[PDB]
Amino acid sequence: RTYRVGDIVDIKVNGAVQKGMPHKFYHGKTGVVYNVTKSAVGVIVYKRVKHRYIEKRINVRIEHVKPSRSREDFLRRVKENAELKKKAKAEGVPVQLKRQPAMPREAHTVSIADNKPVTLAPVAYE
């Protein structure tokens, strides 16, 4: 795997390699890149103390850093929000582009037929 300076990488920290292992406070956290070396990769990652954020700079080898799929939903969204807007302006019709947070369900009717509702009860200890 190859890595740029400025992209988003995520650390996994497997147990196979023990050389220069980050702490358990650094396992499984995502950050950005500022240096790329022969083996180690310079990672900038924020840290949560009290009420604020402080930035720490580290070096992790290529054995545990993977490309981040964090902004994958963005590049899908802007591409799709583009081409629907082309289809909207061509057809002259409006389209809802933003995300709706899944409103509660509306009313409907459930028929009895072919489904006689079974009567249940709790069971004894035996």
Binding site: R105, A121, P122, A124, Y125
Partner: protein, 174 residues
């Protein structure tokens, strides 16, 4: 727990493309109000099968009233409670004019003689004892016996609590 009522609660899994028209399970639940009746319904249903409230819906809540609340009858309640030791099963008998009155009788009776609360107690089956000699219980047996007639000795009369002083010593023959 309070003036409970009977509730018929029917519900089923939220349908998917794989399983349209799910199975529509139904349960009878004694509860003080509807939001407790629905909570007990999902509590039991997750106990038997894998359905949960988040992936499930409730299709009906209906009150089951007494057909003849002016008739006096005998009730057999099958029961299950979790103590510190574990879970046990028993069967009580009650004499009331309605099933919710007998469940009211059970909950006070079970909390008194066994110290069991609403969460531990599980209703198994409450059924009207249709015919005599199906009563398996002594203190009900003397009550269903022929030509019951007992006196009321030593009945303390109602003296108002705000009448602190009385001029005549009360009589307990009324």
């Amino acid at each position: 727990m309070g003036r409970l009522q009977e509730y018929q609660v029917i519900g089923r899994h939220l349908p998917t493309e794989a399983n349209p028209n799910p199975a529509l399970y139904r349960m009878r639940i004694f509860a003080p109000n509807e939001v407790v009746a629905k909570s007990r319904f999902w509590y039991f249903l997750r106990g038997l099968k894998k359905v949960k409230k988040a992936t499930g819906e409730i299709v009906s809540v209906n009150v089951i009233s007494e057909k003849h609340p002016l008739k006096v009858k005998n009730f057999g309640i099958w029961l299950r409670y979790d103590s510190r030791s574990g879970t046990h099963n028993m069967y009580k008998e009650y004499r009331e004019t309605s099933r919710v009155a007998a469940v009211e009788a059970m909950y006070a009776d079970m909390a008194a003689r066994h110290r069991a609360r609403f969460r531990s107690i599980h209703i198994l089956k409450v059924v009207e004892l249709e015919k005599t000699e199906d009563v398996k219980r002594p203190y009900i047996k003397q009550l269903v016996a022929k030509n019951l007639s007992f006196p009321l000795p030593h009945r303390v009369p109602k003296i108002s609590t705000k009448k602190i002083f009385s001029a005549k010593r009360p009589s307990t023959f009324s």
